[model samples]
Target: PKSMQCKVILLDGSEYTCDVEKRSRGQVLFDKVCEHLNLLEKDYFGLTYRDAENQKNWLDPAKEIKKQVRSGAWHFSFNVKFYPPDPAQLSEDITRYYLCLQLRDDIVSGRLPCSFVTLALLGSYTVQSELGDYDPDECGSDYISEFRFAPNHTKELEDKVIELHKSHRGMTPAEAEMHFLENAKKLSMYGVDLHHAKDSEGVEIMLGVCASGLLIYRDRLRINRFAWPKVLKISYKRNNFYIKIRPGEFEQFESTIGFKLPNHRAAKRLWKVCVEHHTFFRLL
Candidate 1:
C-alpha cells in the first residue's frame, strides 16, 4: 500500500485514526493533531510509540514516519511531554485543560509516587476544574468517587478531598487548574526525577538528577546528595557514568564515583539529562 494508517491515543483516553502516505514525515501527523485541538502551545505536547519490547520512542519530525515504526505497528500515545513550572501563566485555557488530564493520568498510574496528602490536594483541584465550585445542590459527597486521583483511592481520602474542594467555593475551571499547578509544585518528584541504575559495587540504586545535581536513592529513598558545585566533571563510557567529586565535598577526599546504566542508551541519556538541566538552569 502507498498509504499507511496509525492510531493515536490522546491524553483524554480517546483514540484517533489517521492516514498518511507510507513515506510521509512525522510532522504532518503531529501537525494534524495540534490543528484538531486548536492548540498553539504545541511544543508542550508530543507523540510517542512504545515498541513490543517496551522500549520508548519519540516522533522524529525530521524523518519519515514509516522509518520509525515496524511493520504492523501503528499505535502511538499523544501525551503531555513536558509541564512547565509556571503553567498558571500559560496563554490558553485549553492548554491548561490538557495538563489536568496529564496530571491525573500520572497519579492514577502511580508512575510518580507522592504522598497521600498531595494526592487528595490534587484531586480537589481536579474536581473543581471539571465541575466548577462546590455546591451541595450541585452534587453529593460521592461525587469525588467518580474520579480516581491515585491507585490508593479510598472513602477516607475521598472525604478529605471533598473537604478541600468545598473550601474552594467559587473557583473557575481555569482558576482551579491554576491552583492545581501551584499545588503540584510541592511535588519535587516532578522537578527532580529518579531513574533506575546500578552503583559500582554491584548494588542496585536509583540515580536521580535535577537542577541541583545528583541524588542516589536506595530502598526507594534518597541516600545521598551531590550538588552541582560538588560534582566537578562527568563523562560516560559504555554503560558506566562517571563523575568527579570535589575533594572537600565528601570529607576532604576526592572521589570519582561511577554508576552502571543498564544500557548505553541510558548512560548517554543520563549525561544529557543532568548536563542540560544544570546548563539550562544556570543560563538564567
Candidate 2:
C-alpha cells in the first residue's frame, strides 16, 4: 500500500490487495519479485565473515529498503550485497550471506510481501546451495505462477542484468548473483603475492602477501525482479585506490578482490588493464 502501488485498480477487496486472480498478473508478478528480493536480502543478512582482528569485516549488507521505508520509495532502495566469508570456519562452502533481515520483518508486518522463496517456476535452479543443502540447481518444485509483464520491457531488464554477468548463454540474473556472492567469499580468502621484501637472515625471503588476485564463478539464475546486474571496479597504485562501478561488481570487488565473471569473455575483460591514455583500468 504505502511501500508500493499497483498500476491497475482492483475493486475485489482483500484478494485484490494480495491475490493473483484479483490483481493484474503483471502487477502480481512484480510484487512477487520484489517480495523475493526483499526476503533474500533480509534472510541472508546474518551470514558474514570478519578478518583475523575482526576490524575489517565485509557483507555488512545495508537494510536500505527498510531503512528508507520512511522515504516511501522502498522499491528503489531494495538491494542485496555480496562478499567473502571466513575461511577458517568449518563451512568453507559459503563464507557469508548479506541480505536484509528487515525485509522479512516487513513482509510479516505487511511492509513487504512473501515469506520465503517458494517459486515453482524457479524450481531448484534459482536457489543458493547454502539455502538448503542439495544442488542449488536441482528442480525441486513446479511452477505456481507466471509473469504477465511485457516481454519487451522484461527483455530490457534481462539485458541490463546480463551485462553484469560473465555468461548469458544458460544463466539468469538470480543464478549469476548467487554465484557471485559465493565466489566473492572465496576470493576474499584467496591471496596473491606482490613485491616481496627481503628478510634479515640474508636469505631471499618473501614478505609481501595480501588479498589481491580474485576469481568468482556462476552458471545461471532467475533474478525475478526489475533490478539490473551490478559491477564495481577498484584499482590501487601506491597508497591510494580508485573505484568505478556499473551495476554488478561493487560488493564482490570490495569484499573479494575479483568480480565473478560468468563466462570466459567476461573474465578476460575483467583482467585487462588499460595503460594507454585513459585514467581508468578497463577489463579488456
Candidate 3:
C-alpha cells in the first residue's frame, strides 16, 4: 500500500521493481551521475507514473525520482531492464550509464552515425545520414499520437470502394468517368489545395489528417521546413476519401476561421471530413 513497498512499473521501457529500502547509497551516486549527464530517464523511455492521473512521466514536486533499474525478464513485451544500483558497483554503473547516454545522444542528434543506438554498441558506431539527424524536427513538430482514419470517413470510403470492386458492381468506363467527375465536384465543394498544385486532372493530391480537437496543439508549416507540408502519392491507393493539403491552409484557416489546426495525422482526417461534410465550406 505504501509507495515505497510498491515497485514502480514502466510497462514498455522495462518492468522495474524498486524497493527504496534495499537500494544502496549507489542510488545517490547514480543520481549524481544522472544529474551530471543531464540524463532524462522517463522522457527517453516514454515513461508514465502509475499514480499520477495516468499521465506520462513527469517529475513530482512531492517525490524524488530515484535512479534505479529493476530486475525483470526481457520478455517480448519489454525492451529494457532496471534495478536499484549497488553502491559498490555505482562507479562502474555511473560510468557506463553516462557513456551509454552520450553514445545515445550521438546517435539521436546525428553526432554519431549508427543504424540504431542499440546496434551501435553491439558492433560499431556508424550512423547513416537519414538516421543521423536525430533532432525532434526530423520527425515533425506535430503533437502526434496514435492516429487512424476517422470512423465515419473510413466506413464511407470502404463501402464505396467495396461496391466498386464487386464483380457485378464494378464501375464501367462511363461509370469510372462519372465517378471521377462526381468525386471532383464533391471534393471541389470543399475547395482546392494550390500550394502543391492547382486542382487539375493531371496533378496529384496528398494530405495528412487529424482530429478537430487536435487543432488545440499546432499547425502545418515549420520554420526549417523539416516537417512541413508533404506532397506524396501512395503506391497503393487507400480506399477512402483523398485529402487535398496545402501550406497556406493554416494561415488562411486562422485568418478566415479564427483558429489553427492540429498537426497530428488524426486531425488531418477530421479536417478533410469537416471540409466535405460541412455545408459551410461550399457557402462561399
Candidate 4:
C-alpha cells in the first residue's frame, strides 16, 4: 500500500513527523498520533486544516488519508474542536488538557460570548483546571489574575472568580473542564451567539442556533424553541426567513412560520446558519 507523511503540531509546541497509509482513514492517522504521545483522551481532539478555499475544516476520519492531504507534503493541527466535548467519549487527562486549550482560545478571542457572571464562572473553571484546588492563604492573587481572557472583567467579576475557585478544592483538570462544560451548556445561550431579528408582529427578538435546535429569545428570555426534529425545511425570501415545521397531532392548519429580518443579507445569513447546524448535527 502507498504511504503519505505529514507534520503534526500539538498544543504545547511539540512536533512529530509521521507517515500513514495512503488508503488509511484520518482516524487511523489520528490514533497513531495519540499513541505516539501516549494520549488517553483521544476522542476529545481532531486534525484540522484549511481547504482550497481557505475555509478551516476538520479532516473526516472516514475519508482516505490521500484525499485529505496534498500529493507531496502537508501539515495538520491536532486540536480540540468541540466545546465541552462529549464526556462519554473522553477517558484521559491529556484529552481534558486539549479541551482546556480550546476553551482558553475561545475565551481570549471573545468567540465564547456570555454575561460577565458566566465569563467569571468559566475563568474560575479554567483556573481550577490548570492550578488544581484553591487555597486562599496558600494561593496567590496571580492564580486568578493571570487569566486576562475576557475584556469585560470587573472587580466584582474578579471577586466571583476567586469565590468560585475556592469551591473546587481537589478537582483534576479533566474534572474542571467537565464541570465547566456541564454548567455552560445549561445556560440559555450555550454554543450560541445572538443574531437580531423581528417577528410578524414587528416585535424585536434575538435568534440563536445550538446543537438541539433554533432558539427564540425575546429580551433575553427564551420565549420559544424549534427543535431540529420539528423543523422540516428552512428558506428565505427578500427580507423574510421561514421555518417549515410538521404540524403536531392536534394542530391542523399551520406548516411554516416566518420572521422579518433587517435585510435579505441578514435573512440569508440566518438561513445559512440553520443549514450549517442542521447538516453538521443532523446529517450523517
Candidate 5:
C-alpha cells in the first residue's frame, strides 16, 4: 500500500514520472505508462528494467511492485513486445507506430524469431508503413534488400511481399494496417503463450491466458471461456486441473470444470500458467 516514484522512459526520447503502489504488480505500472501516454493499444507494450543482478526482465503484473523492481531510485523503460504486420495498422496512433519501429529493429537484429513466410509478411508491412504502398514499377531489388529482415531469404521475402501486396489492391496505408490488426487479433494465440493439453475425454485442447482471462480451445474452436470475474479459484492435483467459477446469471449452482492432462508435469505447467495469468490479469 506504500507509494513509490519511478521513471518511465519511452522509445521516443520522452520520460514520465510515475507514482505507483509499491505492492502493485507490473501490470499496474504498465497500465499507468499507457494511461500517461494516452496509449489505446495496451498489449503491445511492457515495462522492462534491469534487476540487481543486471538481468533485463519484464515486470510481471501479478507480482507486487516492490518485489519485482528496486525499491528506490529505479527506472523502467516502456517498449513494444508485439508487432502487427501492417504499417497502416499503426499509422493513426503514435504509440502503435513506435511499436512498429521497435519491432522492425527487433527483426533486423534477429531478436524476433519467425518462419520465412512470417518474416516476409512482417517485413513487407514494415516497408508499407515506412514508404506507403508497394510500387512494383518503382520498387527494385535494391529497395527490397533495404527492408529485408532475414538476409538469407531476402529475395524470397521480397517476392512474397510483392505477391501479398497484390491482394491489398485499393487500400491505403492506414487501411492496410487496420486490416492487419483485425486479422492478427483473430489468431488463437495472438498475445498469450499456449500449451498443448487434453481433457478427460481425451479431446486435444490448447490452454492460454491473457490480460482478459483464461481461454480453453478444442482445436481452433473455443469451447469454454472463463473470464476473471467468474473464476473464484484455480488448482491442479496429479493429472487433473480444476477451475472453480461463481454462479452464472439466474442460476443457483456454482460451476467447476476439470480437465485431465497427460501427466503430472503437464498438469503442473498448466497450473503455473493459470497462476501467473490469474496473478497478472486479476490480481491488483
Candidate 6:
C-alpha cells in the first residue's frame, strides 16, 4: 500500500485535504485536521468513514487507516462524536461554533424539534455569527434568505429571523455563538439523541442520551431522568435495553429498569451512545 490522501469536510462546509504517510494511523490524520483548525478540545470530535455495508465507523486512533477503511474514495467527515456536557466550558469559540453547526443541522432535520419562536431565535443567532450582526445595506433585505433553519421552513419564520437579527446589532461572532449555545442548552431536545423504545408496561417511550444523563421521554416531554452517576450498569439482552440503578436512601435498593427497543441493532445503538456519554460525562 502507499500513502493515503484524504479530505475532511468541516462543520462550516469548508474542506481540508491532506496527504499522509502510509504508516500514519488515524491519530496523525485527526491531529493534522485539528492543528489546521487550531482545535484543542478535540476529544469530542472524530473522523468517520462509511464502509461498503453502509455502516459509519470511527477510525481507531491506533489502527492503520488502510485497515479500518476498506477500498474507497477516502472521503472522511469531521463531526461531533462525544458531545460536551456544558459546551460553554469548551476552550475555544471555534469548538463551540462547530457544535452550533451540529445543533443547527439537528434542528433543521427535525432531530431537535422545539417551538417556532425558539427556532427563529436560534436562526437569528446563527445569522449573527456568520454575518456579524444585521445589516440592511450589506446583506440587503435578503441576507438570511439562503440559510435553512427548519424542516418546515416558512415565510413567517424568515421574517422572525430578520426581525430578531436586527436586535443583535453589536454582538461579535464569539458572543453570538455563546448566546446561541446558552439558549440552545435549555431546549428540551438539547443534546439528546432519542431512541424509540417501550417500557415494561409496553408504553411507547424515547430513551434520550445526552451530556447530562439518560432522559426518559413520553408524550413529547421528559417523564424522568437517570443521571449517569446513578446508573450502575447499561446492558441489553436481545432488543431489551436495561439500566441498573444505584438506589438512593428513600428509593428501592438497586433497581433495574428495562425498555424494549424496536430491534437488536437499536438496542446496541442506544447502549453504545449510553456508554460513550457515561464515560465522557464522568471524566469531565
Model 4 lDDT, residue 66, Cα: 68
Report how far off residue 67 is in candidate 1 (Å): 3.2
Q: Which candidate model has the greater lDDT, 4 or 6?
A: 6
Query: Please, what is the TM-score per model?
Result: 0.80, 0.18, 0.21, 0.61, 0.50, 0.84
Residue 113 Cα positional deviation in candidate 5, in Å, after optimal superposition: 9.2
Candidate lDDT (C-alpha), each: 0.78, 0.27, 0.27, 0.72, 0.66, 0.84
Winner by TM-score between candidate 6 and candidate 5: 6
Evaluated at residue 85, the lDDT of candidate 4 is 21
- Candidate 6 least-lDDT 10 residues: 136-145
Any runs in candidate 6 off by more than 4 Å, and if so which? 20-25, 51-57, 62-73, 138-144, 198-204, 237-240, 250-253, 260-266
- Output the number of the TM-score-best candidate: 6
Best by lDDT: 6
Model 1 TM-score is 0.80
Order candidates by TM-score, high to low. Answer: 6, 1, 4, 5, 3, 2
In angstroms, the error of model 4 at 179 is 2.9
Residue 247 CA displacement from its true place in model 1, Å: 8.1
Q: RMSD (Cα, Å) of candidate 1?
A: 3.6
Residue-wise C-alpha lDDT for candidate 6, range 215-279, written one tens digit per residue? 88887555888877888999988999999989787876889899999877678768877897887
> For candidate 2, lDDT tens digit of each residue in 1-284?
23344221111111212233321333233345445433332321221222233321112233322322233322222222211133223232221222212222222233222212211111222222223323214322321212221122234333322232212335544443354333333431222112222222332222112222221211123211111122244444332222243545343433222222223332232232211102211221
Q: Which lDDT tens digits does candidate 3 get at residues 75-97?
A: 11111112112212223433334
Single out the weakest 10-residue window by summed lDDT for candidate 3.
73-82
Off by over 4 Å in 5: 1-46, 50-67, 71-92, 95-122, 135-154, 166-173, 194-207, 215-232, 235-242, 245-284
Instruction: Name the 10 consecutive residues with the lowest summed lDDT in model 1.
Output: 275-284
Better by lDDT, candidate 6 or 1: 6
